[PDB]
Write a structure and sequence with these properties.
Interacts (via protein kinase domain 2) with CDH2 and (via protein kinase domain 1) with ATP1B1. Isoform 3 interacts with TTN/titin and calmodulin. Isoform 3 interacts with ANK1 isoform Mu17/ank1.5. This is Obscurin. It comes from Homo sapiens (Human). It is found in: Cytoplasm, Myofibril, Sarcomere, M line; Cytoplasm, Myofibril, Sarcomere, Z line; Cell membrane, Sarcolemma; Nucleus. The chain has about 110 residues and is mainly beta. The protein has one domain (about 10-95): Immunoglobulins (Immunoglobulin-like, Sandwich). The protein has strands spanning about 20, 25-30, 40, 55-60, 60-65, 75-80, 85-95. It has a 4-stranded mixed beta sheet, with no helix packed on it. Strands 2-5-4 form a 3-stranded antiparallel beta sheet, with no helix packed on it. It is elongated and about 75 Å long. The chain starts with 17 loop residues before the first strand and ends in a 14-residue tail after the last strand.
């Protein structure tokens, strides 16, 4: 018929340097050798779902979301599931200080 679950949870693809643009919403993902609840961390704190953050994983796929990208956010995100742990640097290009204009010409 079917099989069970053998071996712990090990990152297959692992997290890679995610470079996005300020303002946008960075989205990182990583494959898992097995289906299990993982955890995301940003520096000296454990990310959580509810505050400008979305932590969810489908079967054996993790996907972290960080609404409100900033220059400070860009650093190093770590993912912990059980015994193994991965890390990756995130870059955030600060939007070019621009201005808004009503209109070039009139008519």
């Amino acid at each position: 018929g079917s099989s069970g679950s053998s071996g712990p949870s090990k990152f297959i693809e692992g997290l890679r340097n995610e470079e996005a643009t300020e303002g946008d919403t960075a989205t990182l993902w990583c494959e898992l050798s097995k289906a299990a609840p993982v955890e995301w961390r940003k520096g000296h704190e454990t990310l959580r779902d509810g505050d400008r953050h979305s932590l969810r994983q489908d079967g054996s796929r993790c996907e972290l979301q960080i609404r409100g990208l900033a220059v400070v956010d860009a650093g190093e995100y770590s993912c912990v599931c059980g015994q193994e742990r991965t890390s990756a640097t995130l870059t955030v290009r600060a939007l070019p200080a621009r201005f808004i204009e009503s209109g070039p010409s009139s008519g």
